[PDB]
Design an enzyme around this catalytic site. Structure first.
Site, mmCIF file in Angstrom:
data_model
loop_
_atom_site.group_PDB
_atom_site.id
_atom_site.type_symbol
_atom_site.label_atom_id
_atom_site.label_comp_id
_atom_site.label_asym_id
_atom_site.label_seq_id
_atom_site.Cartn_x
_atom_site.Cartn_y
_atom_site.Cartn_z
ATOM 1 N N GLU A 83 50.846 -26.703 67.547
ATOM 2 C CA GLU A 83 51.745 -27.842 67.461
ATOM 3 C C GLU A 83 51.144 -28.963 66.628
ATOM 4 O OE1 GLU A 83 51.697 -28.331 71.711
ATOM 5 O OE2 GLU A 83 50.944 -30.398 71.542
ATOM 6 N N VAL A 84 51.982 -29.875 66.131
ATOM 7 C CA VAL A 84 51.584 -31.014 65.324
ATOM 8 C C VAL A 84 51.921 -32.271 66.110
ATOM 9 C CG1 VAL A 84 52.213 -32.264 63.211
ATOM 10 C CG2 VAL A 84 51.850 -29.780 63.155
ATOM 11 N N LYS A 99 47.398 -31.452 63.476
ATOM 12 C CA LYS A 99 47.816 -30.086 63.722
ATOM 13 C C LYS A 99 46.777 -29.339 64.567
ATOM 14 C CE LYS A 99 49.222 -26.243 60.875
ATOM 15 N NZ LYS A 99 50.146 -25.826 59.782
ATOM 16 N N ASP A 192 56.159 -19.337 51.280
ATOM 17 C CA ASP A 192 57.068 -19.864 52.299
ATOM 18 C C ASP A 192 57.698 -21.212 51.907
ATOM 19 O OD1 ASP A 192 58.579 -19.818 54.657
ATOM 20 O OD2 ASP A 192 56.907 -20.575 55.934
HETATM 21 C C1 LIG Z 1 55.805 -31.823 61.681
HETATM 22 O O1 LIG Z 1 54.837 -32.356 60.765
HETATM 23 C C2 LIG Z 1 53.996 -31.478 60.134
HETATM 24 C C3 LIG Z 1 54.061 -30.102 60.308
HETATM 25 C C4 LIG Z 1 53.175 -29.263 59.642
HETATM 26 C C5 LIG Z 1 53.262 -27.791 59.879
HETATM 27 O O2 LIG Z 1 52.508 -27.010 59.315
HETATM 28 N N1 LIG Z 1 54.207 -27.393 60.737
HETATM 29 C C6 LIG Z 1 54.356 -26.003 61.158
HETATM 30 C C7 LIG Z 1 55.766 -25.797 61.730
HETATM 31 O O3 LIG Z 1 56.648 -26.937 61.612
HETATM 32 C C8 LIG Z 1 53.301 -25.612 62.176
HETATM 33 C C9 LIG Z 1 52.525 -24.473 62.001
HETATM 34 C C10 LIG Z 1 51.562 -24.124 62.932
HETATM 35 C C11 LIG Z 1 51.360 -24.907 64.049
HETATM 36 C C12 LIG Z 1 52.123 -26.038 64.235
HETATM 37 C C13 LIG Z 1 53.086 -26.390 63.306
HETATM 38 C C14 LIG Z 1 52.225 -29.815 58.794
HETATM 39 C C15 LIG Z 1 52.156 -31.185 58.616
HETATM 40 C C16 LIG Z 1 53.034 -32.046 59.278
HETATM 41 C C17 LIG Z 1 52.923 -33.514 59.065
HETATM 42 C C18 LIG Z 1 52.161 -34.149 58.104
HETATM 43 N N2 LIG Z 1 52.338 -35.462 58.264
HETATM 44 N N3 LIG Z 1 53.178 -35.734 59.283
HETATM 45 C C19 LIG Z 1 53.538 -34.553 59.773
#
Ligand SMILES: COc1cc(C(=O)N[C@H](CO)c2ccccc2)ccc1-c1cn[nH]c1
Ligand SMILES: COc1cc(C(=O)N[C@H](CO)c2ccccc2)ccc1-c1cn[nH]c1
Ligand SMILES: [Cl-]
EC number: 2.7.11.1
Lengths: 378, 377
Positions: A83-84, A99, A192
Site C-alpha cells: 500500500e501507499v 510505498k 504497464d
Molecule cells: C497512490 O499514489 C502512488 C501510488 C504508487 C503505486 O505504485 N501504486 C500501486 C497501485 O496503485 C501500488 C503498487 C504496489 C503497492 C502499492 C501500490 C506510486 C506512487 C504514488 C504516489 C506518489 N506520490 N503520491 C502518491
C-alpha cells in the site's frame, strides 16, 4: 599498489554500487535478523557472533531511518504486495507518499526482484517526468519508498470528474509521450502504461509512477484493457512499441470516454484486443477529429508497422499535436489544463478512499538475504 | 544529526562497524553460504548470484597472502607460525603471524586474537611490536608486524654469559614494557624471554599477546618455569612481576630458580618457593640483585609491584652511570645486532616442518567469529 585501495574506496562511495556503506550495513542487519532465534543460537559460532554485535546493532537500528519516524495520515493506494500511505515526517513536518511492500508476500508469492528497478528509476532518473524517491529503508516486515507526494491524483480520477476536450487530451498525451521517451532513454520499457500510473503534481503536470513492471532492454531493445496484443500472445521478445500501444488506448479512452477493447468479461477484452484489426471502431456519437482518429490508429496496429518504432520523432510531428499553446521543448513549464486547488499539505481529495507474519525457524532460512542493499539515503 | 552520529561510528577504527569490518561481514556471509548443498535454498542461491561478481572483485583488490613473499619460517606455535615475508609491491620486509581458523575453532579457543591484534595495532609504545595490517582468507588470520632482527632474549642468553650491567639494562626495559601494558589495563600472563624481542639496535619489545586479559574495576582477571604460584593454585598485575624475578635469576645464575627434571617437581618447587629459592654458591650476583629477585619471588600479597611501578624503579639494583628511566631506550644497548641484509634471520633458529574445514550440508557459520579482524593502518 594503493591504486587498488583507491579503486576500492571509489566503489564504496558510489551510490549505484552494491557494496556502498548503506548496502554493507544492510548485510550486517540482515545477518543479525536471520540468526537471532533461540533454535539457531544453540550453535556456538552464531551465539558468540550475535553477542558481539548485539549492542552495536541496537545502536544502529535506533539511529537509522524507521517507520516510527513518520505519522500515517491516510492510505491513498493499495496494490499487489502493499500500500501507499500519505505520511508526515515527525521531525521535519514534511509530507511524503510512502510505498510499503510486504517482505513475507514477496517471498511467498515468489516475486522478489521487481523492486530493484522501481527503486533505481525513482532514486536516479533525475527527470521531471518520474516521481522522485528521497529515502528507501527496510525493517523486518517491509520495504519502504518515501517519494514526493503528488496531490493532483491520477488521470483515472481526472477522467471520471471531467468531460475531456481534445485540447486537454493533446496536452496529457504529449506529456505521456515525453515521459515514456525519458524511460526508454534510461533503457527501460514500462510494460504497464495506463492512467492509474499517471499522477499529477501540485501544478497539474504529469509524472509516471508504479515501475514494478519495468525491464532493462537488451542490445536489440527487447525484453488487461491496456495490454498490447504481442504481450498477450505469451513466452516471446517484445520492445518499446508495446508502450506506445498503451498510449493509443489512453488517447482513445480520453476522447471517447470508454476503452477501445472494453468487454464485460476478462476473456472478452483479450478476444477484442487480439482481433484489434476488426474490433477497433470509433462510435458515431464520439467527438473526435480526423487527426486524433488517425493518431490512435497509428498506435493501435500490429507491432511491425506501429508508430514509435523508429523513435519518438515520428510521433512528435504527427499533425494531431499542432497547437497554439505549447512546444515539445516547454510543455511542462506551460499552464496545465487543471490545476489542483488544495486546502492543506495533507489534502488527499484527488484520491479515492482506501497481517501474515514470518514463522520462527528451527534452521537458517535467510529471508532477509534478497533485500540486502535496498536502503538508500539521499 | 542521527546520520552524523552514525557516520562517525563507521569512521572510527576501533568501531566494530567500521568499513573494513562491514566488508568482512559480507565476505564471511558469502564464504559460509557458497556450498551446493546450501545453494538449494532459493534465498541463498539468488543472494549469492547477486554478490558473486562484486565479491570476486573485492577479494582481488583487498590485501592478501599472495601480495607477500615468504622468506623463511622464523617461529612456530600453538595455532600457526610466524614467517619472515617481503611485500611484493613495496619490497618492505615484515614478520607475518598466521593463525589457522580451523585449529582455533576445533580447539575451542577463538577470542585471544582480538586483544593481540588491538595491543599491536593501537598501543603506540616503543615497547610493543607494531602491527601494520591485519587481514584474512578462508583458512587463516594474518598479522603483518615490524620484523625484529635481534631475535629473542632466549637466543641472547644461550650465546652470551650475562653480566650484571647487561642484566640491569634488560630488566629495566622489561619493567618499562610491562608498565606500558599495565597502563592499558592489561595483564600479559606470559612474561618470559621467548616473548621478549630485540630490534635492529638491541632494544627490547614485547610480543605474543595471545595470553592477555583486560583487568576488571579492581585490576584482577579470570609456561612451566615462569608461572606464578597463585596461577598454579582471580590474579592481578603483580603476577607479571613474578616472571620478571624469574627472568633476572635466569640471566645472572644461568638456570631457572625452580628448575626440576619433571613437571610435577617444578610445580612443587614453585609452591614451596619460600624454602626452594636459593642462590648457588658459585653464582656471581650482588646483594642488590639478590634482594631484587627476592622482592619479586614472594607471595602475591607482599610482592614488589603490587603498590605500583614506583617501588620497582627506585630499587638500589638499578643505580648506574649509563642510563635513566626517562632515556634508557635512547642509550646504547649491550648487544647491537650485526646484520648482513634486510632478511638476515640469523638470530632465529631454523624451524622444522594439513586439516581443512568439512563441506557442510546446512549453515555452520565458521567465518562468523572472524568478522572485524581486517585492519589497515
Ligand atoms: C497512490 O499514489 C502512488 C501510488 C504508487 C503505486 O505504485 N501504486 C500501486 C497501485 O496503485 C501500488 C503498487 C504496489 C503497492 C502499492 C501500490 C506510486 C506512487 C504514488 C504516489 C506518489 N506520490 N503520491 C502518491
Ligand atoms: C618469531 O617472531 C615472532 C613471534 C611471535 C609469536 O607470537 N610467536 C608465538 C610463539 O612462537 C606464536 C603464536 C602463535 C602462532 C605462531 C607463533 C610474535 C612476533 C614475532 C616477531 C618477529 N619479528 N617481529 C615480530
Ligand atoms: Cl508543436
Amino acid at each position: 599498489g594503493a591504486s587498488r585501495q583507491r579503486k576500492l574506496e571509489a566503489l564504496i562511495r558510489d551510490p549505484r554500487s552494491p557494496i556502498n556503506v548503506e548496502s554493507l550495513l544492510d548485510g550486517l542487519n540482515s545477518l543479525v535478523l536471520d540468526l537471532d532465534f533461540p533454535a539457531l543460537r544453540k550453535n556456538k559460532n552464531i551465539d558468540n557472533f550475535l553477542n558481539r554485535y548485539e549492542k552495536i546493532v541496537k545502536k544502529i537500528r535506533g539511529l537509522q531511518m524507521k517507520a516510527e519516524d513518520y505519522d500515517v495520515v491516510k492510505v491513498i493506494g493499495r496494490g499487489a504486495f502493499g500500500e501507499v500511505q500519505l505520511v508526515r515526517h515527525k521531525a521535519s513536518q514534511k509530507v511524503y507518499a510512502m510505498k510499503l511492500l510486504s517482505k513475507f508476500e514477496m517471498i511467498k508469492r515468489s516475486d522478489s526482484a521487481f523492486f530493484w528497478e522501481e527503486r533505481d528509476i525513482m532514486a536516479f532518473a533525475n527527470s521531471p517526468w518520474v516521481v522522485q524517491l528521497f529515502y528507501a529503508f527496510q525493517d523486518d516486515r517491509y520495504l519502504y519508498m518515501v517519494m514526493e507526494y503528488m496531490p493532483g491524483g491520477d488521470l483515472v480520477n481526472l477522467m471520471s470528474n471531467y468531460d475531456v476536450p481534445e485540447k486537454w487530451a493533446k496536452f496529457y498525451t504529449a506529456e505521456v509521450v515525453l515521459a515514456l521517451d525519458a524511460i526508454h532513454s534510461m533503457g527501460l520499457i514500462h510494460r504497464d502504461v495506463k492512467p492509474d500510473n499517471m499522477l499529477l503534481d501540485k501544478h497539474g503536470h504529469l509524472k509516471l509512477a508504479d515501475f514494478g513492471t519495468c525491464m532493462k532492454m537488451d542490445e536489440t531493445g527487447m525484453v488487461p484493457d491496456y495490454i498490447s496484443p504481442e504481450v498477450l500472445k505469451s513466452d516471446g521478445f517484445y520492445g518499446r512499441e508495446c508502450d506506445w500501444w498503451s498510449v493509443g488506448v489512453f488517447l482513445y479512452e480520453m476522447l471517447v470516454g470508454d476503452t477501445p477493447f472494453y468487454a464485460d468479461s476478462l476473456v472478452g477484452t483479450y478476444s477484442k484486443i487480439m482481433d484489434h484489426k476488426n474490433s477497433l471502431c470509433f462510435p458515431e456519437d464520439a467527438e473526435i477529429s480526423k487527426h486524433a482518429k488517425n493518431l490512435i490508429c497509428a498506435f493501435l496496429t500490429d507491432r511491425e508497422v506501429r508508430l514509435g518504432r523508429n523513435g519518438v520523432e515520428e510521433i512528435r510531428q504527427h499533425p494531431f499535436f499542432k497547437n497554439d499553446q505549447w512546444h515539445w521543448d516547454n510543455i511542462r513549464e506551460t499552464a496545465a489544463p487543471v490545476v489542483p486547488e488544495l486546502s492543506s499539505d495533507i489534502d488527499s481529495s484527488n484520491f479515492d478512499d482506501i497481517v501474515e507474519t514470518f514463522p520462527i525457524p528451527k534452521a537458517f532460512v535467510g529471508n532477509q538475504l534478497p533485500f540486502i542493499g535496498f536502503t538508500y539515503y539521499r
